[PDB]
Design an enzyme around this catalytic site. Sequence first.
Site, PDB file in Angstrom:
ATOM      1  N   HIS A  11      15.011  79.222  14.501  1.00 17.40           N
ATOM      2  CA  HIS A  11      14.234  77.999  14.729  1.00 17.40           C
ATOM      3  C   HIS A  11      13.770  77.709  16.152  1.00 17.40           C
ATOM      4  O   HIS A  11      12.917  76.856  16.320  1.00 17.40           O
ATOM      5  CB  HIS A  11      14.960  76.774  14.153  1.00 17.40           C
ATOM      6  CG  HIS A  11      15.256  76.898  12.695  1.00 17.40           C
ATOM      7  ND1 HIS A  11      14.263  77.033  11.751  1.00 17.40           N
ATOM      8  CD2 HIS A  11      16.438  76.950  12.020  1.00 17.40           C
ATOM      9  CE1 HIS A  11      14.817  77.125  10.547  1.00 17.40           C
ATOM     10  NE2 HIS A  11      16.137  77.097  10.686  1.00 17.40           N
ATOM     11  N   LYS A  40      12.115  85.384   3.721  1.00 15.21           N
ATOM     12  CA  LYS A  40      12.381  83.910   3.801  1.00 15.21           C
ATOM     13  C   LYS A  40      11.088  83.147   3.460  1.00 15.21           C
ATOM     14  O   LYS A  40      10.002  83.424   4.036  1.00 15.21           O
ATOM     15  CB  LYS A  40      12.998  83.486   5.153  1.00 15.21           C
ATOM     16  CG  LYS A  40      13.462  81.988   5.213  1.00 15.21           C
ATOM     17  CD  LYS A  40      14.191  81.642   6.502  1.00 15.21           C
ATOM     18  CE  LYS A  40      14.405  80.105   6.598  1.00 15.21           C
ATOM     19  NZ  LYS A  40      15.467  79.914   7.580  1.00 15.21           N
ATOM     20  N   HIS A 118      21.242  73.640  11.494  1.00 16.80           N
ATOM     21  CA  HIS A 118      20.436  73.593  10.274  1.00 16.80           C
ATOM     22  C   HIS A 118      19.176  72.835  10.571  1.00 16.80           C
ATOM     23  O   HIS A 118      19.214  71.758  11.192  1.00 16.80           O
ATOM     24  CB  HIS A 118      21.196  72.908   9.110  1.00 16.80           C
ATOM     25  CG  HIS A 118      20.333  72.564   7.931  1.00 16.80           C
ATOM     26  ND1 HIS A 118      19.752  73.515   7.124  1.00 16.80           N
ATOM     27  CD2 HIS A 118      19.959  71.366   7.420  1.00 16.80           C
ATOM     28  CE1 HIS A 118      19.032  72.925   6.181  1.00 16.80           C
ATOM     29  NE2 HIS A 118      19.135  71.618   6.347  1.00 16.80           N
ATOM     30  N   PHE A 119      18.059  73.390  10.132  1.00 17.16           N
ATOM     31  CA  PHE A 119      16.799  72.680  10.216  1.00 17.16           C
ATOM     32  C   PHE A 119      16.486  72.087   8.851  1.00 17.16           C
ATOM     33  O   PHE A 119      16.289  72.812   7.856  1.00 17.16           O
ATOM     34  CB  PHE A 119      15.704  73.627  10.701  1.00 17.16           C
ATOM     35  CG  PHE A 119      14.414  72.950  11.004  1.00 17.16           C
ATOM     36  CD1 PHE A 119      14.019  72.719  12.324  1.00 17.16           C
ATOM     37  CD2 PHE A 119      13.571  72.544   9.961  1.00 17.16           C
ATOM     38  CE1 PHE A 119      12.786  72.090  12.592  1.00 17.16           C
ATOM     39  CE2 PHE A 119      12.387  71.891  10.230  1.00 17.16           C
ATOM     40  CZ  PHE A 119      11.998  71.668  11.544  1.00 17.16           C
ATOM     41  N   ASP A 120      16.429  70.759   8.785  1.00 21.31           N
ATOM     42  CA  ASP A 120      16.292  70.087   7.488  1.00 21.31           C
ATOM     43  C   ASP A 120      14.845  69.827   7.016  1.00 21.31           C
ATOM     44  O   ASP A 120      14.498  70.083   5.826  1.00 21.31           O
ATOM     45  CB  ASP A 120      17.158  68.798   7.451  1.00 21.31           C
ATOM     46  CG  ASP A 120      17.568  68.407   6.032  1.00 21.31           C
ATOM     47  OD1 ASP A 120      17.151  67.297   5.569  1.00 21.31           O
ATOM     48  OD2 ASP A 120      18.262  69.233   5.350  1.00 21.31           O
TER      49      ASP A 120
END
Lengths: 126, 126, 460, 460
Positions: A11, A40, A118-120
Amino acid sequence: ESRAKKFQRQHMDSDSSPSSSSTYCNQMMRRRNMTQGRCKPVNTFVHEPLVDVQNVCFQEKVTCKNGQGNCYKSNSSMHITDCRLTNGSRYPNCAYRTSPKERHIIVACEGSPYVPVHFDASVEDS
Amino acid sequence: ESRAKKFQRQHMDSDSSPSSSSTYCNQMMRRRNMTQGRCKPVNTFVHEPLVDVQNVCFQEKVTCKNGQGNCYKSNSSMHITDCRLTNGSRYPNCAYRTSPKERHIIVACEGSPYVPVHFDASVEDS
Amino acid sequence: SLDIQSLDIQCEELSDARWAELLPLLQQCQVVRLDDCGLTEARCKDISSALRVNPALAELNLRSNELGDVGVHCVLQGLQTPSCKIQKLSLQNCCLTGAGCGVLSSTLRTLPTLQELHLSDNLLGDAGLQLLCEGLLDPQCRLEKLQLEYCSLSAASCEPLASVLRAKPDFKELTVSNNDINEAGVRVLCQGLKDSPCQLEALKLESCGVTSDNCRDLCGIVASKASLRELALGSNKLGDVGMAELCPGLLHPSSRLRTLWIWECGITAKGCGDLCRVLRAKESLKELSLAGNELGDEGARLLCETLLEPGCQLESLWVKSCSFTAACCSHFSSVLAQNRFLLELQISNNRLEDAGVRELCQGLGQPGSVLRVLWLADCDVSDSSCSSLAATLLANHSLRELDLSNNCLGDAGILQLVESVRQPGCLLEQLVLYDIYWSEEMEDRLQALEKDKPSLRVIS
Amino acid sequence: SLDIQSLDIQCEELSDARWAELLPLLQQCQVVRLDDCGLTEARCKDISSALRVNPALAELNLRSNELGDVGVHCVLQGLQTPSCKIQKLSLQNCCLTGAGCGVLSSTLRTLPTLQELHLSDNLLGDAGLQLLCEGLLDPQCRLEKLQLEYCSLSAASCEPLASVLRAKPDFKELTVSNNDINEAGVRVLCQGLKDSPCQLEALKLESCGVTSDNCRDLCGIVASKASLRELALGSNKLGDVGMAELCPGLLHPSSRLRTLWIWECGITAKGCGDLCRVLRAKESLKELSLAGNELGDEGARLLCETLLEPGCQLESLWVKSCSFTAACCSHFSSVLAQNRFLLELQISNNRLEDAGVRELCQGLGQPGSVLRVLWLADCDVSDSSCSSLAATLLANHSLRELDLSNNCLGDAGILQLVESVRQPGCLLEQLVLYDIYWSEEMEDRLQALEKDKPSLRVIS
C-alpha cells in the site's frame, strides 16, 4: 513479514508522483508481489510520507467493513492510486486499470507501536 | 555429424560384453541420443571391433530392404544386441527390451573410404 | 547428451556484480527472461554479445525494460549470427517506437526459426506497423504468432496485416486487442483471414471498437476456421444483436471453438438465450467468459437450465459482475449438485449474500459433485457464510481452490475455515484471501497452518 | 521479485572444472536434474552443501548415478534445513539398497513439503520397503505420489503399503509396476485403497502378476474412486475374462477414468467388445492403449464402430501390434473422415500394406478431418503409397506429426514426401523416419529441408 511490513509492501508508494500513468498498476502490482499464484483483484497505493499514513492510527476512529472497531479515517484526503483487475484477466496475465485520485483513506491499526496493518477503504467526501 | 559417424553412434558398441543385461538398452538408447523428441522403436548395437564391421562392406553384396544395391551381408555371425521399445512406452519414458544374440548383419556402405552408413538387418541362416 | 538451462528474472535491480555473473548464463540458456530488470542500452550491448555466442537460445523475453529503439537495435543485432535458433521473442513494453520498426522489419527477414513475436505495449503507430509488415511479407519470415496489443494502431494498419495473413499458410495467432481499429479495420482483418489458408488457432480483438455489424464478419470466420480454438472479443459493443449474428457461425458443425471470451460485451438475458443454444449444441466449447455483462437472475436461470440438460460439456464459466442476486443461487446449487463437466465457476462480484452462498454450499456439499475451483470474491460473504463453507470443505472432496477475497470476513469467519482446512481429510490446495482484515493473532494461526500443512497455499 | 532458474543435464561426463562451474547453480536453481552424469560420493558432499543454502529448491532429480546408500545419505542431509521446500525428489536407479532404507525412512519423517518420491530401479527388497513404510506412516510424512517400479518387491510388501494408503487421505499416485506382487499382493493393495479415504488419481500395476480374478479387486477400486484418472495394467494376464470383470466398474456413473493402459493383457476381439461398451458409454475416457493385444480386424471393426457413435470421445488410440490387416483400413478410414474427437492414432507394426495406407489417406484427405498425430511405423509401407501420403499432407490440414519409421521406403518415395512437406501450404511439424535408408544425395536434401524449414523437425 509482519502485517505491518506487508501493509508497507502492498500500500505504500511515497516516492511516486500522484499522477500515475496508465501502466503504473501492471508494473507495481507485479513488483510488490501481488500477482504470484493469483492476481490480487483490487489494491490501493498511497503517495504520501510513511509517517503521515502512520499518524492516521491516531485520527478519527471508524468501523471497519468487517465490523471491527479499530479502523481510522485520515483527517485529510491523500494522493492514492487504485488498481483494479480487468474483467478479462486470467492468471498469469493480470491486467489492471490505474485510477489516481485524492481521497481519504481508512486503515486498521494494531500492535506496539500502533501502526497500519490493513487498508480498508477510501472515502470521497469532497 | 557424418553418416559414417552416425552409424557408429547408433550401432557400434565394441567395448561392451556380448551378454547384455536387461537394462543395457535403456541406458544405451539414451546415451547414444536415440530417445530425443521420439523414442527410436527398434535398434541394434554390434559388439565387434569397428574394423570387423567395416570389413563387411567387402563381403557378400545383397539388396537393401528398400531396393538399393549396396548392402552387404557379413560372412561371420557377430555378437549383437537388439533393443525393442516396449508396447506401453510413451515419450519421454522410453523403455526397451534387450535381446543379445549372434547373427549375420547386413549394412549399407558408401563413400571413400567405403564404410557402413546404415544398419539394414540381421539374418539367422544357421 | 543434453544440457538445458533456463533463467527467468522478474522485478529485480541487477548490480554490476550480479550482471557479470549472469553473462555466462546468457551465453548458455535455452530460455532467458529478464522482465522489469532495469535493462539499459549498455546492458543491451552485453546481451547482444552473449547471444551471438549462444547456439542454444530458443526464447528471449525482455519485457518491461526501458530499452528504447537503440536498446532494441542492439539486442536484434545479437540474433544475427548463423548459429541463432530463436523461436520466441518478446519486446513487450520496451519503449519501442515507429523509429525502431525499420530495424525490426529488416531483422525479421533473416530469422526463419522465429515463430512467435510479442510487441504489445509499444507505441508503434500505423507507419511503424506498415514498415514492419514489409519484413513480415518476406518468404523468409516464418512467424505464426503475433501480439500487437496497445500498439497505437488504427484501421490503417489492418490492410497491411490482412496482407501478412494472406501470405502465411502457417499462421496460428493474432492479437490486436486495445487498438482502435474500429468497424472498418475489423472487417478488413476478417476478410484477410477468410482469404488466407492459415489454420488460425486464436484471434483476439478485445477493446477494438468491434461492432454488432462486425459480428456478421466474425460469424464468417468462426464458420470458416475449423482450426479456431480461442476467440476473445471482450470490451466491445457487441450487444444481443451481435450475439444473434455470431451464434449462427458458432452452431456450424465444423466449428470446434474451445474458448469464447465475451466479457463486457453489452450482452443481456436475451443474448444469453442465443448463447445457451450454442452451449447445448456444441460440446467442443469448454470455457466461456460473460464477466461484466448485465445478465441478471434471468441470464443465470437460462445458463443453469442449459447446464442441467445433456449436451453442454462446459468446463469453466466466468460470470463475475453479472448482476446476479441470492435468487439465482438455487439454480447454480442444482448445477453444482448434478452437472459432471463444470470444474470451475467464477461468480465473484455478485450480490449473492450469505443466503446465496449458503445455497451454493448445499449443492457443492451433495455427494458426487465435481467442482474443482470456485471464486466467490466480493459476494457479500460474512462470517455467517463461513460455517456453510467449513461444512462443504469437509463434505465435498473435489474442490481444490477457493477464492473468498474482498469479503466482509474477520477472525471468527476465518477461524471456522481454518478448523476445516487444517484437517488431514480436507484436500483443498489453495485458499485465496486477499483484501480481508484479520488480527495478528489470526495471522500467526495462519502462518502456523501454512507450516503444518504446506500442501495448502493461503494467498494474500 | 522472482528469480527462477533450472538446470537439466542428461548423459554427460562432467570434468572437475565443468562440475566446479555447475555447483553454484545448485545453490540457486528451483529445479535441478543431473541424470546419468557419472555422479560419485565426492560429488554428493558437494551437492549436499550446495543444496543446504538453496532457498528455491522445489525439484531434485539425480536419476541413474551410482550414488549408493552413502551417496544418497549425504544428499538427503542437504535437505534437512528449516527453509527446505523440496516438493519432488527422484533417486531412481541410484544403487540404493535395503541397507540405505533406514536413513531414507528416517529422513522422510522430516520433510513435510515433499510430495513426490521416485525410488524405481533400486534393489530395495521387502525388508527395505517395510523399513520405509515406517517413515511413510509418520503423520509428518506428506507424500502424495510414490513410484516403486523394479524395486524387488513381492506380495509381502503389499500390506505395509496398504497401511500407508490407509494412513494418507491426500494420497494421489502409486506405481508398483515390475514387481512380482502377484494375485495376493494385488488384492491386499486394492483393499488398502478401498479402505483409504485418498482421492487417488493414478494407479500403475504393470507387469505385477495381476490376474483375471484380480480384475474383480480392481473393479471395486474403479467403481469407488471417482477421482481416478489413470489406470495402467499393461503386461498382465487379464484376458477377456479379466476385461469383463473390469467393465462393470468402468461403467459406474461415478467413474471418470481418463487413461486406461491395457497393452499386452491377453485381450482378443471378445474382451475388446466388452471394452467398447465402456467407450460408447463414457465420454470421459480420452486415452486407451490396447497395443500388443491380438485384436485382429474384428477388434479394429468394433473399435471403429464405437468411434463412429456419439458417446465415444476418445482422443488417443494406441493399437500398435494388434494383428490388423489391410482389411481394417476401410473402417479406420471412415473414422478419420467422420470422427471429430480422435486426435492421435498409433497403428504401427500392423500389416496394413500399401493398399491399406492409401485407404487411410483417402479418409484423412476428406474435408473436415481432425487427426493431429498418425503413427504408421512398420506397416509394410513402400514407395507405392508415397503419392497418397504426399497428397494427404496437402489435402488434410490438421495433421501435425507423422511417423513412417522402419518401413521399406526409398529415395523415390521419400522425395515425393519432401516435395509436399517443403511447401508453405504443408503444416506438418514433425516427420519421424527412423531406420530408413536413403542416399548421400537424399541425405543432403533432407538436411537442407531441415535448415530451410525449421518449423518441421525431421527425426532419425
